[PDB]
Design a binder for this molecule. Structure first.
Ligand SMILES: *[C@@H]1O[C@H](CO[C@@H]2O[C@@H](C)[C@@H](O)[C@@H](O)[C@@H]2O)[C@@H](O[C@@H]2O[C@H](CO)[C@@H](O)[C@H](O)[C@H]2NC(C)=O)[C@H](O)[C@H]1NC(C)=O
Ligand SMILES: *[C@@H]1O[C@H](CO)[C@@H](O[C@@H]2O[C@H](CO)[C@@H](O)[C@H](O)[C@H]2NC(C)=O)[C@H](O)[C@H]1NC(C)=O
Length: 352
């Protein structure tokens, strides 16, 4: 049964709060991540090495960095101007080869599963919350080092305030060394989270957005048209929450088109949406064990009682909370609230 009285965070499931850093976009891209990357190269090397070994194990024929590295020069030009220089700055501070920073930035998404939730209270105001796990590759694969690596990643979790001099452009939950983001919001406009979709990974290999929307989109409408129509490297689920009552949708994407766009409709009894890493119309497999208990616990909460505290209760209930859960994030776009908490799951707790 669902957890209760878990907010404000305390106890063994609470690893601590996520530190805040300001990223000044007025600075030259090369310098933006300098302060953040201090003293983080050792941990980041552990993460990068983990990605390599998992990719090599998944495709024993070839070595991944060989291909990225040998195909690297072309990749740099493929990137928009700022990202290349931001990554070179990261490589310099950390003394990590540029190719490995790029490998980390390209493939990080494929090692994340998440539970993303949008809800609307009777007042008509949206809450956006998310539990993020790390280490599970393509939604099912792990190795005997996954748990050690995930614990090493938690100190890299950071809340980022992207600013233009002294004005906040957008806020995000991210990871030092990763210049992209899978969780962010623009105060008073919209919130956005990305869940990985597995249908894909070869496409990236064959080939070898959230930031751009957060940085330059001026409205929920604009972000929606970009997220629905723009081409993307791999399939994904976009969970987009707005400020206005009823501005909440889940976009299921493939490389080229939106396979489904599903909106909240509290008038017709749909006051929440729970998106994990499988298509919501399909039936869940044995491995998809997170969405149903979340829906079960939201149903018991009722729209009347939905809040930060009751939302945190849902995201503190196993298996929604699990051993590989890195952080819990709570967002209220209208009021500008953005809370992120590191998590633990003491035994007995399932991996994911
Ligand atoms: C994860 O496993 C690797 C591989 O080691 C083998 O598998 C283990 C389950 C165990 O049975 C080992 O005895 C096996 O040899 C571990 O890598 C080894 O680490 C130590 C160094 O401290 C040593 O045994 C070897 O140098 C390593 N072997 C290889 C092939 O690299 C690794 O330590 C395991 N991780 C954890 C967290 O235990
Ligand atoms: C968000 O928009 C700003 C301006 O709208 C972008 O800044 C430009 O980025 C281009 C490439 O996208 C660079 O070549 C230019 O140097 C930048 N121009 C200015 C005037 O700063 C910004 O790049 C966009 N978002 C991201 C993530 O790059």
């Amino acid at each position: 049964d669902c957890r209760k009285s878990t907010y404000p965070p305390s106890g063994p499931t609470y690893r601590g709060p996520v530190p805040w850093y300001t990223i000044n976009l007025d600075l030259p891209p090369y310098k933006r991540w300098h302060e953040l990357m201090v003293d983080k190269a050792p941990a980041l090397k552990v993460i990068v090495n983990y990605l390599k070994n998992m990719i090599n194990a998944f495709e024993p024929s070839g070595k991944i960095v060989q291909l990225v590295d040998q195909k690297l020069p072309g990749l740099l030009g493929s990137f928009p101007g700022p990202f290349e220089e931001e990554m070179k700055g990261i490589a310099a501070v950390t003394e990590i080869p540029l190719g490995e920073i790029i490998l980390f930035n390209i493939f990080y998404e494929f090692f994340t599963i998440a539970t993303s939730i949008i809800t609307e209270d009777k007042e008509g105001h949206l809450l956006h919350a998310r539990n993020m796990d790390f280490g599970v590759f393509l939604g099912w694969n792990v190795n005997n080092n996954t748990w050690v690596v995930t614990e090493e990643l938690k100190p890299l979790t950071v809340n980022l305030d992207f600013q233009r001099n002294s004005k906040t452009v957008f806020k995000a939950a991210g990871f030092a060394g990763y210049v992209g983001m899978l969780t962010g919001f623009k105060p008073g406009l919209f919130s956005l989270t990305l869940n990985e979709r597995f249908s894909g990974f070869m496409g990236v290999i064959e080939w070898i957005i959230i930031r751009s929307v957060l940085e330059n989109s001026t409205s929920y409408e604009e972000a929606k048209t970009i997220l629905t129509k723009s081409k993307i490297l791999a399939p994904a689920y976009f969970i987009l929450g707005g400020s206005k009552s009823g501005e909440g949708c889940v976009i299921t994407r493939d490389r080229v088109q939106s396979l489904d766009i599903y909106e909240l409709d509290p008038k017709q009894g749909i006051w929440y949406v729970v998106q994990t890493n499988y298509d919501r119309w399909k039936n869940p497999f044995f491995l998809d064990n997170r969405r149903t208990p979340a829906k079960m616990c939201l149903n018991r909460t009722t729209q009347e009682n939905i809040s930060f505290a009751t939302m945190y209760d849902v995201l503190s209930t196993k298996p929604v909370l699990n051993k590989l859960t890195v952080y819990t994030a709570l967002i209220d776009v209208t009021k500008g609230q953005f809370e992120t908490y590191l998590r633990d799951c003491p035994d007995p707790c399932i991996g994911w």
